[PDB]
Design a protein around this ligand. Structure first.
Ligand code: ZN
Ligand code: ZN
Lengths: 328, 328
């Protein structure tokens, strides 16, 4: 058994990502933590927080070593400008993108067994003149990925999104048998080859309230959702639904599921966040590599202060680690 | 003080409403429970359930008296045909609607402090040639209500819906300033006049994920929601601007708010359903009187069997009582 390596991108320097990473470093880890970021950034922030940090260099041509408490391994990318916690900085936009580009490739190459990302600020990135829609779009394109799927998981509750950040008004047309087949395939595949579930049991939400109540609140379940499930169920895939989302989200139903397929953003996330502030993880399915992320944003306001909550990041790390195990 | 009267309509005689009312009658009550139903119907169901029941006649020309355990007060209405649990009898559709009419007028004329409804079967009512768009629409109409707002509550969380049963594709255009202005007005009005919450605190969801995230993920928050909210804030209403639905159901917000206002069905009820077990209550806002209701169907299958579950009915009644006492 060879010790594995994982790359972490704290993301937005002015954000709380660097803080959270310093806290992560305060413990033992079965894998080596290769943090792609500015050393000075990590050093100062650590200092402000009052937490000891010791960076050791990324040595690719050497056996990997589990990261020991108070330490992290470094894969440097330099800040384009100095950093003051709490205040953004347009140019650091290229820095954030740099570390994201370096980490992705590392996983595309094979240097790292997984990528766990910290919160980034899109705005600042775009203002710096860089085309950026979010991590899930960045890693998707840079990997030449046919299509991915987003998931937010806690422990026993995993929710997948057929469509993501689309205005409410454009959802209906977006859900087509084409979208659904690609989607469920990647979901079912990954629940098996990543989460290690032999026979994944997916619950499926209907597009409409009450799953369209057949005759009344919509025909999308009759025209595209049901036919596709009828196909995949016949292929031995276990798919329960379309079910009204406000019936499906009960333990009587959940305690017998491996995951939930929500048709859109607000149909599945509200219950998840409610279910776990800390513990949630966003996992990108479909990517040519294991990638998880936190469930929160940059929280500039709390940066450098000394109060964080690495709960999500830690969870995203642990899960990234388990997936390694189930994918090795 | 004086004892308050509430009126309860068990509803469809063949369903669980009657079993439920008998069950709720096994404990003491701070108010007189005037049940608008058939005497023999309640007594038979109580005997089949092995539960004691002693009816005393409703007598308006007398002081109300807190209901004693094992008893109920009765506002008689003759069934049209005998009743057999689990079997719909169309001639009895007139009985059901007659109890709704009687309880309704009772509330409208000051006889009763509130109305608490058990499940009703629309199918059998229409089958008897009786127009019935719905249980809550019936009261909406009999009381010349300009408009009603549906709320789902759990004695811990209150969720109002700007729009209910509509195909997902129709919500976007359905949310006009006109609709939103009114819905909020009634919500705010009733939290104050029916819940007794002087100066109510309301959290409003945005229509799109991330509440629009500027104008790059939905233009409605800018086009109609925020404009309507600012105006309403001028009126002195404490409205907490369009928030992302996925992060609104966090304790930091909920614990310091009196109600949430979702733009649509699946955006607000799933959390409510998840955090509710069965204690979900249906509250109809905008009527000239207080009205609470169970969050379930008639369950003909369970009728008479003895294994109902009075969770919803007890909450509905306890909530209606809390509302009464909190507004005397
Ligand atoms: Zn999102
Ligand atoms: Zn509904």
């Amino acid at each position: 058994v060879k010790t594995q390596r994982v790359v972490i991108t704290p993301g937005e320097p002015a954000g709380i990502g660097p803080d959270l990473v310093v806290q992560l470093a305060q413990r033992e880890w079965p894998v080596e933590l290769v943090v792609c970021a500015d050393a000075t950034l990590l050093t100062n922030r650590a200092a402000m927080l009052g937490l000891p940090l010791t960076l050791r260099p990324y040595s690719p041509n050497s056996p990997a070593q589990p990261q020991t408490a108070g330490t992290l391994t470094l894969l440097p990318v330099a800040l384009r400008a100095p950093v003051t916690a709490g205040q953004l900085a347009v140019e650091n936009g290229h820095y954030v993108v740099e570390t994201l580009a370096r980490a992705c490739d590392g996983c595309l190459n094979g240097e790292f067994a997984a990528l766990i990302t910290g919160p980034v600020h899109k705005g600042v990135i775009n203002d710096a003149g860089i085309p950026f829609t979010g991590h899930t779009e960045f890693f998707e394109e840079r990997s030449q990925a046919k299509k991915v799927v987003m998931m937010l998981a806690t422990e026993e509750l995993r929710v997948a999104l057929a469509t993501t950040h689309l205005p409410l008004r454009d959802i209906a047309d977006a859900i087509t048998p084409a979208l659904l087949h690609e989607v469920i395939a990647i979901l079912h595949h990954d629940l098996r080859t990543k989460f290690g579930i032999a026979e994944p049991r997916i619950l499926v939400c209907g597009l409409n309230p009450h799953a369209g109540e057949g005759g009344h609140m919509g025909t999308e379940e009759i025209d595209t959702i049901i036919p596709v499930l009828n196909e995949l169920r016949a292929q031995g895939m276990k798919l329960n639904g379309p079910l009204p989302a406000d019936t499906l989200f009960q333990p009587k139903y959940l305690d017998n599921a491996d995951a939930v397929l929500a048709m859109y953003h607000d149909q599945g996330l509200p219950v998840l966040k409610y279910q776990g502030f800390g513990r949630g993880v966003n996992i990108t399915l479909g990517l040519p590599f294991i990638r998880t992320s936190v469930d929160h944003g940059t929280a500039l306001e709390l940066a450098g202060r000394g109060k964080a909550d690495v709960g999500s990041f830690i969870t995203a790390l642990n899960l990234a680690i388990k997936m390694i195990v189930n994918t090795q």
